[model samples]
Target: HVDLTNCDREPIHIPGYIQPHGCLIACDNAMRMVLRHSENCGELLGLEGDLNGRTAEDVLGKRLVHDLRNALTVTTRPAMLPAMETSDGRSFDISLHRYKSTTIIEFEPSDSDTQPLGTARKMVDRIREADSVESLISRTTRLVKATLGYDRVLIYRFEEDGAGKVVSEAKQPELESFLGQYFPASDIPQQARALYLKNTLRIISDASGTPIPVLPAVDVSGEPLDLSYAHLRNFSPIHCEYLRNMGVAASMSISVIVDDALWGLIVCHHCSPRVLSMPVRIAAAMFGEFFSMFLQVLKQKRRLDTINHAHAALDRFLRLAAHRANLEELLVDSFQDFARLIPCDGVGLWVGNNWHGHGATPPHDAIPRLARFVASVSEGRVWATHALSQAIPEAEIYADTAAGMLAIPISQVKSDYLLFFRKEIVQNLNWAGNPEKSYETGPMGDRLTPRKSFAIWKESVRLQAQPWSEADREIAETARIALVGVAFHHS
Candidate 1:
């Protein structure tokens, strides 16, 4: 029985089962004999045995094994072997890969369809020419659904904290849409995420089908086979159950990697069992790689623009500072203009015991107290927070006018700093489900779980303001450098 309490730590990669659609055979490095295989391997390949000592050449034939060796020499990653005639006179598309000390070979019914590859290339070419990330993802999702004939396709992006959101989606008109919905990070646990980084694609041809066990379940080392890179690796029972709960019959996920890191997933879901030919699967994987590269280019281009804008804002502040004799004079005369460098509701300058600023800020008397609180948090540098009252309860008095704050120290020599304020902006997020209720108890024990219903659930967010962007913090840093020069001129 599976232990739900430690489900996240489960050794899913060592699952002793494989999907029935394909046959898996594990052999020693030299390919002399089979060490482990799926129970249905005999039916699929016409090789019967407790067959550990039997020679692989006798079982798989010399021509197929030779072809596998040739394929292995060309690539370290999974590569398809040429179509081969099996002992049963049926043709199969074989894929081979080396994992650890063993070689894993998988065989699936050969697909003669070649038109999808041409269609896939054209779609990918169009996706590469997309002008923006949004447009690229939208185009990719629609293409994936149309080409693969899946009921739905989604571009699921991951946040820094691991939560995922369906940013783009394409589905049959009869199916309900999941676009803009969010899923808790636990839906894909840390361990599962690690596997996704190592493997480029995963497919569940039949979510409801039984998993076929390995013939010799335990290996010579008394361990389950490491099926980490197996194309026919069985779905973990828990994951299978999770899909069933979602009313899905099959699913496939292609990794969207950016800068060698897992950025998101191109997820395909079907309402009935589906099998994607080897060429189609390979096409999808290629497109995923191309999309990942395009996404990074777009990200860097946007970042460059943001940096240029920030430098311009800093230049304006430095020019203003040159005409003034002191920080107080500059801030008092052009407080609103200085605050425009950042997206803020108000601005204040604390130089010595005096306060100077304009707009929806706290009263002058409370400025010193706020400054001290910010100093504690800033530690003599730049600091920001969306919920000011949470950091300093005294800030609650001015929550309506200044619920968020960004403080940047001007100089280490004196107690001088600039503060920017943002008023509270109420928010109602339409969560896919209650994020707090992301776990439940199963027959074995408590485990993190996906919500059964993905209905739109609203959440009220209070006592906060619009969170600062990376560019905002970067502009603050740029402004800090300019302020240091201005302080030296004024001091």
Candidate 2:
């Protein structure tokens, strides 16, 4: 009954089978079998009575003794266990244990049950409605949070460097809004992401899952590149240790594939232990596929619209700001233009390389002073997810009850001039903060503050989020170019 029950046994040949010998005798008999047959006997030997009285030499022909002797000497012992090789040219675990005389071996193919194909397909269908990719994207994210009941769900899109932007999110309303936040790419290093792609998805049911390792590529051999320990196991230990430091108990992820390529992933987090089931995993994969397809469609469909909408907003800002109009008109009325142009809360702009004195009016007092803070420090082109936290103080940006904020530097100018919008104003019906009022900013203009709202403008700079899109860059460039001609008139 003991696990090590086979620790001892004498070499013996029964009435109906060939015998195994001691380390010495086994070597001698095996060599004899090879000599008589002029070939290796170990490979030809069978498990039972079928080879009665016939040594391996009779079955195996002569050409294998030298190869066998050389190979056997190279290893701890002479043995070959049946096993499979993967498409990636990797060999999996195969074991064959031999004591004084007995041999026990096992071969196990790799287990991929962790990744379920069927469930993945189903979840994809549930989250995406081909008719509306954007809406589906938004819905799928919400479903992810709901399905897993995680504190946060992030649709992280990777960029050229080791950086990523959270383009979509669904989380508890009370947590710091992460919907459009950007985090460092190193958070999921090349090693981590590589594992994700290999698995197509990865789930850390809890912090307790075995951690990946990190080890040196070569040992003293300077020879066979001890890639033996070069797997994820080697790299993830430090990473998990870091996560533990962050107070996160669990995480799960799915790869985001498009055009048959992996761009990034959807990562979910929980403040507490969160274990997902097979069904849930399937659902997540399905949703990932839907999300991937939708992104592909969106990439193609929104190219022109995104550019057009941003340009249209710029056009309106230029016309009003450059006209023989009141400075207040340039700042306040622009909100209406932005609301109509891109369905946002309020439109704001800053002047100079560092937003010295500029910005559009918002519909309410919740306007975080990010615009003012950034214009004070930022000099070159930059984008941020939560500018308030990065460069501007939280007290300034959060005071206005702001949720999400996005900023882009005006690249044409010598310094950094920028623009931003609060989430409420961008997505809601209008400046009213309520849809019933026809979303008009003029009605909500009174909600904007400061003795002279025009001078209230300030820069709130910070390092956050991925760089803006080509359209965003264009917006910045165009603003800079035009600001030259209009500066004299406006200032």
Candidate 3:
């Protein structure tokens, strides 16, 4: 039974243990000697005895030590040492990665001698053929499931809020789906998210298996081993317990990173213990990189296309104002055109406290209060939010009309602004369970246990509309400049 006042506060990086499937050896940068090593060194690597304080030449021999030195200078990412072996003659898949000043060397039994890069090309081909982001992610999950053979595979996308939802899935027959299930931000915790940004791939061969302790705990520097990059790093107990509750014996998460931020994960699950070969893991990681690159390509391509449409719309709107009608009449008449540039349910055009609202709008009395808050925006850029009520307490009163706001400051000296609003479109969120009660009573009848129920818990979320995308902000800024030019010419 495990009891924790805080789940994420436990230092997972310096856990001083690793999954027993692999043997880990932490050493100084110079490859002089071993700083620490997993207790299962004999079973996996065939290295005998308490290896602490032994020279790299003494435990691993000179040939492997020389390769380690050369590999460190060549690359920063985890590098595989090709088919190298000790005098014992058994083949092992060896990997080298560095954290802080310490270097980590890992050894696991080789599944096969061949480089397992065959699936990588096929996966890339399938992803390339995809026409939409949804289709691309669906193809990715299927490819990963085909290669790894997990019972279920799904893509969990991170929302603007820290929460996540399963966006795409490819699962075996008769399996209950987690396709549309949601997980609150707290389910992942903050520190885990920070670690995910650094590591590309994570594997849990068997959650029920024992973890081999790294003897001596700390290195010469008195610092615990930083296993942030170790592929063999042990799972966080809270997360392992979380998995145990899910009846999943093994799980793997491949990060879908975009522009250095963790966009989502390709989550794999199996009912029984399953270990993947080092080469297979490498091949899987390669596709993750390709997926991110392509997503960025699609994003830029789509943004350009949308902006072209906005440009056409802006040109048409200016021509309508060519009549040089009175300011209020022109502004009110252009409301329909304004919505096209940045799609919003309503618009409030404020030319120095003078408000001309159209469509769904905050009550007239709410304008002065909203303008004061807009004027406080420091970045001098278009400011927006999907949840306006949360930002301003008074916004709740008119949330039905304007739940979201994208405000463009047209003139700072005059404090004139153009604010676009999206009406509240309440979300019916189906979370896996209540995230706040992630901890529950254990089998031992103790107060500390991971939540056993993963059944859907429905929630009706209010006071938030559709999010304003980066493209929306870019076009809104473009509209601001065009409107300013038009206003100057008309006056």
Candidate 4:
């Protein structure tokens, strides 16, 4: 039997009970066991020698070799899988996770006997029936909502850092909803999403879902444990709170795989609490797999939107070139207009030299690296988030503001320029939701990390009072055209 204990203590164990049958292993998809907690670790896996701190394959043998690797490839979600079969034909179930850092597989076998049909058979049948991945996900999720009678169904995709977006949402139409709205990155947080890697599915039956009491609970005093791990600690209080605020009484999400990299969550919401049966869970999982295939294609066209915006900015760049506009003057005038396209608040172009009036200019007194980089940017140097962040620490503040910002280089030899933007452009006002609450971290706040928000990090846009959107990126391309017009006109 499994027990629970507090992990914030020594040796991770329950106070009284002794583990006899098998041991616990912390592993990756590569089956490399990193940490172990047990006494009879080798005996449990039927391995004759003492094999703690070994690879999972070395410990468990050839049983779950294939499935374990496949599970690791699932960058988007978790799976409840059948474990390896013993020589005598007994099978067990394990919780397989695809985490950013590692792939973890955990299990507590039941006393029940007889293994089920091989997973290979089930996988083959499912693959043959689906025409495409997108269709597969849409069909499965639609079925789940239809079968469950939920108000809305949403396909939410995850960024590498565990932040997610509600991509495809299906609603009953009668239910007035907040579909298409973007949520903040903090809502998911790193710790909370790690929990999703293990649990095949999660359900907030009510806005206040009763805590699934930590197995063999613990109190203060850095106590001991009775269970392998607790899922409760990993829960997101803000997520729970957000649901309550939205008037959503119940919600459930199933993980789906996309391109073996990102994850997409199939979310269900109801106006009342929901209690799913065993059959429903199985059906939901089936849907998750079906949707996994279409993840990339449906997303491919999406990237084009961003590219189109980039192309527009290129247009503006060309126009500025034609006009022979003085480099510094051109950026300020064009950035004001391009700011709308890239979705930043205000646009400031820092020439190799500057004394400017602004909300947040590249603080004239910045590190030499930053100061030098800004100069190079104006002299036709291209930059991305990593390069910009390393040079200018002050610009880090922009990541926190409701401002979604970006910095890109417009190369014209010695007359290089930079572009900056906010999330207000890439996202629609309706979709962007409310502006961030300035200094406070809220459900709609900007993240210091640009990848977390699709915000750009162009060198020219120093600081502003507004936001930008993908549409703005599209327009900013046009902006580059306008600025080029002025530059060439003057030159």
Q: Which is better, 1 or 2, measured by TM-score? A: 1
lDDT (CA) per prediction: 0.77, 0.44, 0.77, 0.47
Compose the digit string of candidate 4's lDDT tens values, residues 159-261.
Answer: 4334455566667766544344444444454434544554446656455554432222332444434232321122334444445655577777776655554
State each model's C-alpha RMSD to the native.
Answer: 4.2, 17.6, 4.6, 12.2
Off by over 4 Å in 4: 1-144, 157-165, 172-174, 205-215, 218-247, 259-264, 300-374, 377-380, 384-413, 416-427, 431-491
Give the deviation of candidate 2 from the true structure as CA RMSD.
17.6
Q: Which digits, one per residue and each the tens of the lDDT, describe model 1 over residues 42-120?
A: 7877765666667788778887778777767773477776466875588998889887878889999888666546866
Per-model TM-score on C-alpha atoms: 0.85, 0.41, 0.82, 0.44
lDDT of 3: 0.77
Give the Å shift of residue 323 in candidate 1: 4.6
Which 10-residue span in candidate 3 carries the lowest summed lDDT? 451-460
Better of 2 and 4 by TM-score: 4
Better of 1 and 2 by lDDT: 1
**Alpha-carbon error at 126 in model 4, in Å?**
13
Per-residue accuracy of model 3 over 1-491 as CA lDDT, tens digit each: 22345664767777888997888988887778887888988886676689988999889888778877887888447887645677578778888987677788998887764365777887788788776676787788888888778998989988777767788888778655666665666667687887788778889999999999998787655878888888898987777766676678998888888877899988899989998887788788888888888987776677788899999988877787687666446765565557777778888788746888878889999899888888887355778989898889989988877889998866534677888898885433343423554333334332223322222112323677768987898898888777767776765
Q: TM-score order of candidates, best first?
A: 1, 3, 4, 2
Off by over 4 Å in 1: 115-117, 323-368, 377-379, 385-405, 411-416, 420-472
For residues 1-491, what per-residue lDDT tens digits would candidate 2 score against the true structure?
10112212211111111111100112122344311111112222322222223543443224333434444444213243222352334432223223332222222233334445565565566655555546765676787787668888877777655555566778776544445433554345454555465444465545545422111222244421111111111223333444454445677777887777667778787877665543454456566666777778877676667667667767766776755466433544343344343323335554432222222333334333555555455554444343344444553444233333445454334433435544321222111111122211222242222111212211111222223355554554555555444644555
Looking at model 2, report the run of 10 residues with the lowest lDDT sum. Answer: 14-23
TM-score of 4: 0.44
